[PDB]
Amino acid sequence: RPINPDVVNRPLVICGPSGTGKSTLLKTLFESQPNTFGFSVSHTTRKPRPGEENGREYHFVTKEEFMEGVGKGEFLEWAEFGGNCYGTTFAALTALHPRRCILDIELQGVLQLKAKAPLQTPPLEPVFLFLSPPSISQLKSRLSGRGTETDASIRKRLDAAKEELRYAKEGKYDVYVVNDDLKVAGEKLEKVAMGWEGWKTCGDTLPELNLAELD
Amino acid sequence: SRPINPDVVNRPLVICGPSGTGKSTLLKTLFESQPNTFGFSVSHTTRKPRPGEENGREYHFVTKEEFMEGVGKGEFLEWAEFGGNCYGTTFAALTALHPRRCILDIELQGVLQLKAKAPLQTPPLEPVFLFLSPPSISQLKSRLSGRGTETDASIRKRLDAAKEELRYAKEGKYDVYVVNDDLKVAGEKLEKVAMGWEGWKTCGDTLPELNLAELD
């Protein structure tokens, strides 16, 4: 079944608390639908993880290089997260044509894109998908289980999750998916990414996440 | 005194330095000494006002969502995050100052952005970048705590930021360095630079030896 023409030019923006499973789910999608999606390679000033390569998951740059690019107008959006800078360059999106663009960004980037996308020529109409953990306890077990972050970074990431989840609870994302069972969540992501009939209503109710557990 | 040098009127003076060094203190005296000469760029920030601050004077105080909407709409010449809050210079804030010489109080990320962005404006913008240094790390800490407006967590973030700010400053790339030791001495140098009076390019200080490990 082919990708819906009505979503090919609508970038799919996936966001959610660190550790929820964004990278893991995207890998299942690209395996299930090869040569269909383009993953936007963001710039970041954080250091690479063992499984990461420069030019694959991120373009890893220094803070001075990052801010030079910002001043040069190279970024569609950028923001600071957990003490490091991240952003989507125009060139990273251009590199993905003609596949449907997929971006993995956080809330400040989402807010920028909601303002900026209508002002592009031609206007861009992203789809904003929020990927939720099934519980805060599972979020913490996944984030610590990944084993790539310092204790200081985990604290910053859990603190950021408070504002990310607070915004998510306002109901403004286009689709919500709870990443409980990987296969069930992956099937929903595939439906959303392919734009198949029913994708807008294929999503989940946000769980009752008491944010005080993030303290 | 003599009028402002025409050669610097259209060169924005960008002042930066570690939080607590004395930027606001010195600028307040500069503007009282030279009224109707300078325009102070009113940045946007998402931090909360301090007791002695008024919306529209020191800052345009906005929410984070308002700030990011403005960013996405292209309203900012530069912006950055500092100490967990956002700050930025809107194009409209500088337009509001013409024809006065623009004075900006921004941090290092904004400086780096402007160094890349100013040459690309039409016409090109040629700022003067001034670094204001504390005389010692111990005096930076006592000034920052003595102001009495920040939480302990905010002080920690500001001192941590000072490490990167001073590391960059030590590279020697600023146009002028002024050590804020004696307020009157530093004020005279700042006025000379802001007015562009003869000698301003050579009036600056050598950056002191500052042990950045003391910031912890």
Ligand SMILES: Nc1ncnc2c1ncn2[C@@H]1O[C@H](COP(=O)(O)OP(=O)(O)O)[C@@H](O)[C@H]1O
């Ligand atoms: N549905 C799931 N069930 C169990 N573990 C999962 C699931 N999804 C992801 N994980 C694991 O959780 C951790 C965080 O996933 P990751 O994709 O790195 O998150 P993110 O990109 O959102 O920060 C990884 O160790 C990953 O293998």
Ligand SMILES: Nc1ncnc2c1ncn2[C@@H]1O[C@H](COP(=O)(O)OP(=O)(O)O)[C@@H](O)[C@H]1O
């Ligand atoms: N030269 C100086 N000597 C002693 N204290 C100073 C001096 N300059 C400023 N201060 C004090 O240090 C504190 C920080 O000054 P401020 O102007 O608010 O710093 P900044 O704007 O760089 O963050 C204030 O309490 C101020 O009165």
Ligand SMILES: Nc1nc2c(ncn2[C@@H]2O[C@H](COP(=O)(O)O)[C@@H](O)[C@H]2O)c(=O)[nH]1
């Ligand atoms: N705004 C923005 N956030 C990004 C970008 N790239 C990654 N992020 C976000 O930064 C956070 C941290 O990513 P990580 O360090 O775990 O790879 C995640 O929420 C991720 O979505 C980007 O290009 N822009």
Ligand SMILES: Nc1nc2c(ncn2[C@@H]2O[C@H](COP(=O)(O)O)[C@@H](O)[C@H]2O)c(=O)[nH]1
């Ligand atoms: N980049 C940038 N930094 C700013 C701006 N306004 C204030 N800052 C910087 O933010 C830091 C904190 O400012 P404060 O909270 O003490 O007023 C200072 O270093 C100040 O120069 C702005 O418009 N842009």
